[PDB]
Amino acid sequence: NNLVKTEFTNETLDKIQQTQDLLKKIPKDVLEIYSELGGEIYFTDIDLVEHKELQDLSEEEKNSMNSRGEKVPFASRFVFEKKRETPKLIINIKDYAINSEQSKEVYYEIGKGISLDIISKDKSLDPEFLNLIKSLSDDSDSSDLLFSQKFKEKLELNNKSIDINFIKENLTEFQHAFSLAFSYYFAPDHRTVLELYAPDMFEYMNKLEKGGFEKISESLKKEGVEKDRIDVLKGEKALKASGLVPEHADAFKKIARELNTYILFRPVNKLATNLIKSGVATKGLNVHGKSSDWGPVAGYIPFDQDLSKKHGQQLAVEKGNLENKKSITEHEGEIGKIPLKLDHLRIEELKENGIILKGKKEIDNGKKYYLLESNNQVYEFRISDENNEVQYKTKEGKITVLGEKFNWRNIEVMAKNVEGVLKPLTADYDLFALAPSLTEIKKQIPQKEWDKVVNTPNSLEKQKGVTNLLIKYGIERKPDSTKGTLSNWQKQMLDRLNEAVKYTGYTGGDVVNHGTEQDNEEFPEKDNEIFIINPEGEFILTKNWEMTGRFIEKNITGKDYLYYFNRSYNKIAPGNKAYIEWTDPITKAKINTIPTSAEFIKNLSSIRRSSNVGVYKDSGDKDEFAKKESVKKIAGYLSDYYNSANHIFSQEKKRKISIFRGIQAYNEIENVLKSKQIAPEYKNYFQYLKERITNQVQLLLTHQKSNIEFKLLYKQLNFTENETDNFEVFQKIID
Amino acid sequence: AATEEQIAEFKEAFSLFDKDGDGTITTKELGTVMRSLGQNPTEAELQDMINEVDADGNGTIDFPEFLTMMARKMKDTDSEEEIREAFRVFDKDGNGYISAAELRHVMTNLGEKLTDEEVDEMIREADIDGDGQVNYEEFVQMMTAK
Numbered sequence: 013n014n015l016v017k018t019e020f021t022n023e024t025l026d027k028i029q030q031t032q033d034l035l036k037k038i039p040k041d042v043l044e045i046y047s048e049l050g051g052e053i054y055f056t057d058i059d060l061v062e063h064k065e066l067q068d069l070s071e072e073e074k075n076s077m078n079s080r081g082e083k084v085p086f087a088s089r090f091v092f093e094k095k096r097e098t099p100k101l102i103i104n105i106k107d108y109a110i111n112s113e114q115s116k117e118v119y120y121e122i123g124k125g126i127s128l129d130i131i132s133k134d135k136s137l138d139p140e141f142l143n144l145i146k147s148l149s150d151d152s153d154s155s156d157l158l159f160s161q162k163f164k165e166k167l168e169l170n171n172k173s174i175d176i177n178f179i180k181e182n183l184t185e186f187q188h189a190f191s192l193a194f195s196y197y198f199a200p201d202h203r204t205v206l207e208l209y210a211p212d213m214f215e216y217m218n219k220l221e222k223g224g225f226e227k228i229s230e231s232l233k234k235e236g237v238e239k240d241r242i243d244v245l246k247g248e249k250a251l252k253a254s255g256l257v258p259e260h261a262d263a264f265k266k267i268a269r270e271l272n273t274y275i276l277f278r279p280v281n282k283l284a285t286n287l288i289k290s291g292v293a294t295k296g297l298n299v300h301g302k303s304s305d306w307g308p309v310a311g312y313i314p315f316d317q318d319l320s321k322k323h324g325q326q327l328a329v330e331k332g333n334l335e336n337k338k339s340i341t342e343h344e345g346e347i348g349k350i351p352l353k354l355d356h357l358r359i360e361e362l363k364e365n366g367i368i369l370k371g372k373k374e375i376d377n378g379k380k381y382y383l384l385e386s387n388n389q390v391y392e393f394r395i396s397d398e399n400n401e402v403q404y405k406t407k408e409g410k411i412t413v414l415g416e417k418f419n420w421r422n423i424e425v426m427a428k429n430v431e432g433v434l435k436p437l438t439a440d441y442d443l444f445a446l447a448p449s450l451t452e453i454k455k456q457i458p459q460k461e462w463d464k465v466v467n468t469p470n471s472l473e474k475q476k477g478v479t480n481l482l483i484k485y486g487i488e489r490k491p492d493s494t495k496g497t498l499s500n501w502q503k504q505m506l507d508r509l510n511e512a513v514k515y516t517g518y519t520g521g522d523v524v525n526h527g528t529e530q531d532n533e534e535f536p537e538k539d540n541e542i543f544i545i546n547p548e549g550e551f552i553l554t555k556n557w558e559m560t561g562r563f564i565e566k567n568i569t570g571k572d573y574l575y576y577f578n579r580s581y582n583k584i585a586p587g588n589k590a591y592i593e594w595t596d597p598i599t600k601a602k603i604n605t606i607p608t609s610a611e612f613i614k615n616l617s618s619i620r621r622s623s624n625v626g627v628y629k630d631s632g633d634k635d636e637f638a639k640k641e642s643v644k645k646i647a648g649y650l651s652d653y654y655n656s657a658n659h660i661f662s663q664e665k666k667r668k669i670s671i672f673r674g675i676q677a678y679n680e681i682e683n684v685l686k687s688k689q690i691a692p693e694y695k696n697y698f699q700y701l702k703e704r705i706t707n708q709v710q711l712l713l714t715h716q717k718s719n720i721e722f723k724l725l726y727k728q729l730n731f732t733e734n735e736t737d738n739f740e741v742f743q744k745i746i747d
Numbered sequence: 748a749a750t751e752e753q754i755a756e757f758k759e760a761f762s763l764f765d766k767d768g769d770g771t772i773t774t775k776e777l778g779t780v781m782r783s784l785g786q787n788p789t790e791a792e793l794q795d796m797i798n799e800v801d802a803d804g805n806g807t808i809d810f811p812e813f814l815t816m817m818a819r820k821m822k823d824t825d826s827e828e829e830i831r832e833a834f835r836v837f838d839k840d841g842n843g844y845i846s847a848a849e850l851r852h853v854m855t856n857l858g859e860k861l862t863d864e865e866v867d868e869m870i871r872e873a874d875i876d877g878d879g880q881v882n883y884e885e886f887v888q889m890m891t892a893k
């Protein structure tokens with residue numbers, strides 16, 4: 013954000029030693045008010061006229077009211093403000109004076125003033141009473157009804173009490189006022205003419221330098237960030253689509269702060285928000301049942317699958333039930349089915365939400381049934397009175413997608429064990445990721461082991477010794493019997509999230525069951541929206557799989573918090589064969605990296621398995637073996653690049669010595685790329701490996717003596733029979 | 748229980764270094780087969796693996812000998828990733844490259860005082876291609892290499 017661009021350094025000092033002499037005059041912060049509104053100041057040679065590379069038709073002169081009082085002869089000017097968006101101040105000088113009659117340097121002041129002015133204390137916040145009352149020093153405050161220096165034509169209107177009764181009108185007039193006032197106080201000569209012919213405006217521009225300028229230099233600075241930021245709808249505005257339970261989230265708001273770690277959750281279905289507040293235990297890992305979104309069952313995991321979202325899918329609903337049955341047969345005593353009992357609230361809720369219509373009543377065998385309505389067209393539902401259970405049956409004129417037709421049965425849902433009681437199951441809180449503060453993990457490590465690592469000689473090992481620690485205690489994710497696959501602190505954190513929401517008012521055990529979906533390598537999933545309880549309460553909900561990814565890059569990754577992203581990201585997730593994209597730096601800078609021995613051998617290995625033809629076949633063609641032996645060489649040159657003993661050398665060296673190992677390889681590649689018939693599948697790979705080497709070398713080069721382009725430098729090599737003097741050449745080739 | 752992918756490589760590389768193309772490799776050779784594949788065992792731990800099963804020319808290990816000898820250190824070692832995450836960690840800016848700047852930085856946060864000398868120092872001895880900065884590749888080595 014360089015604010016002062018000096019065009020021509022043509023003239024020696026004098027030009028310079030005249031511009032500076034000008035800038036040291038203007039307040040170091042009137043600038044910051046300027047270099048904040050996005051402005052820049054241009055000091056050029058003799059461009060004077062429309063000759064400036066920025067003075068061309070854009071937003072020039074529409075209505076005249078220029079220089080202090082008036083004039084307008086453009087061709088006779090040196091100072092100008094490109095008035096419209098980002099204030100552009102452009103000025104110049106010719107031959108050596110400015111003082112004597114500073115009646116000239118006083119415009120580079122107002123001419124400037126018209127920068128901050130209109131957005132100064134005189135209008136941005138609005139014409140704040142501070143100035144609304146400073147404009148009244150017209151003829152009411154002190155016996156100084158003197159302003160024959162800013163209010164001649166547009167304010168010889170003494171017979172008009174100037175308050176909120178017309179000031180809105182000529183805002184610009186009170187600008188020529190904030191300007192020619194700025195110009196005097198800061199003018200290099202007439203500073204007291206604003207202290208004599210003005211009663212307060214001096215005391216104003218003064219308070220201004222006192223601090224006024226540092227003020228807006230902070231409300232513009234603050235708005236600087238808050239303005240262009242990343243949309244997020246914080247506050248209870250998001251906590252609303254977060255699905256989480258307010259008393260809970262608000263409860264969670266305490267831990268983040270305590271341990272200092274972001275907390276991100278996926279979306280907790282609304283039709284479960286309140287079931288959770290109710291007291292309905294959550295769906296752990298043991299159950300692979302499908303939620304539902306219609307009827308009494310809504311938000312519950314019906315043991316009947318043709319009563320959950322998948323209404324019709326004769327297979328997912330088929331193989332759907334099949335899942336609960338085992339969910340029970342496998343984990344019995346903990347997982348089972350209990351009849352649907354919609355309490356009081358729950359109803360008035362599935363009411364104005366639109367899931368159910370409570371109307372007509374009826375009698376059967378002796379009890380009362382209000383009946384429950386829902387446009388589902390193959391199922392009818394009804395709820396008891398004694399004990400508000402619920403029941404359904406196949407409408408008198410239809411069948412069950414699978415092939416069933418039953419009459420009124422109590423609706424069973426899945427329920428786990430909770431202190432010897434089968435409580436109905438609903439949506440849980442699946443954390444999307446826990447972001448502890450790097451500083452926190454330090455607390456995780458046990459002093460003994462950490463101290464034993466810093467008390468080391470080898471500085472390089474003092475790192476390996478450290479990172480392994482940072483991995484050991486803060487990145488490692490072991491699998492677990494119960495809580496899914498997760499970290500170690502991740503667990504504790506995970507207990508403190510429940511013991512947090514239970515020392516409040518929950519009676520369904522724990523509500524966060526498994527680990528951070530960033531470990532759901534198996535069946536990873538992508539959710540546009542993401543709720544995030546900042547390390548200090550601030551509720552937030554991204555909107556894009558990016559905004560999320562962007563939000564995390566901004567104030568998480570690049571901000572000292574330790575975060576790791578889903579292994580299965582960028583690769584194909586087996587479980588669901590899903591491709592989920594996520595900016596990976598290492599991959600961002602692959603384009604320019606000579607690949608490894610193994611990363612190469614690896615890639616072949618991969619294409620072998622596909623077109624079932626390797627780089628080299630198993631035969632006698634001394635042509636084939638030629639190729640085989642040949643990779644064995646690229647598989648060296650590359651290996652030879654990353655040689656650990658490369659340290660006993662020195663930077664400038666390292667680069668070179670490798671720029672060669674590199675070339676050496678780019679060669680043997682170009683070599684085979686010309687040989688026999690290597691399937692066009694490998695053709696490309698190699699085609700790709702080249703660009704790497706290339707980019708990779710162009711780099712090592714534009715690090716030291718840069719001008720020589722790879723391509724060229726190449727030509728110049730004798731890769732014929734001898735390789736000895738070759739390198740010797742290479743040397744000078746770069747001097 | 749090496750995945751097939753964990754085989755194609757293990758062979759695609761077991762052969763590439765098999766001159767007299769039969770199906771067994773010399774001692775000196777096995778060493779080479781392992782380096783290339785990232786790994787790089789010691790001068791005498793290269794025996795205990797082969798030395799333990801001499802049903803061949805007493806000093807030659809076939810492929811079913813090699814593939815079934817990649818567990819002694821493999822089905823155990825699942826650390827590659829731990830390490831690739833401990834990278835993006837240091838890589839504090841998103842440049843895919845580390846730098847004394849960030850090393851020292853993150854070094855302190857984990858509670859450790861590094862001297863602006865012994866950092867423009869680590870970085871160095873970690874850098875192999877002299878580009879002043881450590882990329883994943885060398886980061887890997889420094890860490891794993893013993």
Ligand SMILES: [Ca+2]
Pocket residue numbers: 765766767768769770771772773
């Ligand atoms: Ca052999």
Ligand SMILES: [Ca+2]
Pocket residue numbers: 837838839840841842843844845846849
């Ligand atoms: Ca970096």
Ligand SMILES: [Ca+2]
Pocket residue numbers: 874875876877878879880881882885
């Ligand atoms: Ca490097």
Ligand SMILES: [Mg+2]
Pocket residue numbers: 295296440441442526
């Ligand atoms: Mg879950």
